[PDB]
Design a protein around this ligand. Structure first.
Ligand SMILES: [Fe+2]
Length: 186
């Protein structure tokens, strides 16, 4: 029975229960993420920014079924176009706005990937992506407001592919945590 999380802690407890089994219910997960009201005090600790690019901050390793991490996007910061390694990927805005651009999987040819769709994700909004849906690029296009987001991936994945918008070629990148449980990890 899905309850409203009062707090991040609560949220994380509910997530552990939802992931106790081995097959997830995406809707239910998205609904509890959406229902958590962003409270900066509760996650301030994980919101470590870098001047030059966005940072991944590990919050919870999830008894091995999922990662939960906070990302921090300075003004004009953005990701590349990427997939999610056959995993589920939820994303909640805790603060600010991100622009998400979805691409279709490139065909084997070398041509400019073309954007399926585009949308702004607002605070507390929770979005869901997986590889059957497509690839996406997330950016903070704001010139004045940093953005912070909450990301859940299940199962956890170390690496993903990044795509060249031009040719659609892809590289395996190994995602690195800026911090882990509130501790900076170079
Ligand atoms: Fe992503």
């Amino acid at each position: 029975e899905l309850l409203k999380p009062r707090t991040l802690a609560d949220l994380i407890r509910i997530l552990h229960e939802l992931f106790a089994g081995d097959e997830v219910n995406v809707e239910e997960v998205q609904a509890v993420l959406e229902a958590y009201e962003s409270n900066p005090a509760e996650w301030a600790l994980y919101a470590k920014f870098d001047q030059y690019r966005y940072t991944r901050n590990l919050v919870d390793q999830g008894n091995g079924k999922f990662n939960l991490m906070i990302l921090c996007w300075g003004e004009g910061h953005g990701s590349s176009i990427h997939d999610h390694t056959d995993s589920h990927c939820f994303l909640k805005l805790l603060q600010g706005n991100l622009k998400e651009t979805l691409f279709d999987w490139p065909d084997k040819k070398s041509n400019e990937m073309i954007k399926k769709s585009e949308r702004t994700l607002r605070e507390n909004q929770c979005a869901y992506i997986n590889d059957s849906i497509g690839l996406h690029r997330v950016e903070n296009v704001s010139h004045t407001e940093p953005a912070v987001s909450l990301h859940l991936y299940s199962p956890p994945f170390d690496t993903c592919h990044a795509f060249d918008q031009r040719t659609g070629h892809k590289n395996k990148v190994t995602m690195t945590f800026h911090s882990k449980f509130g501790i900076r990890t170079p």
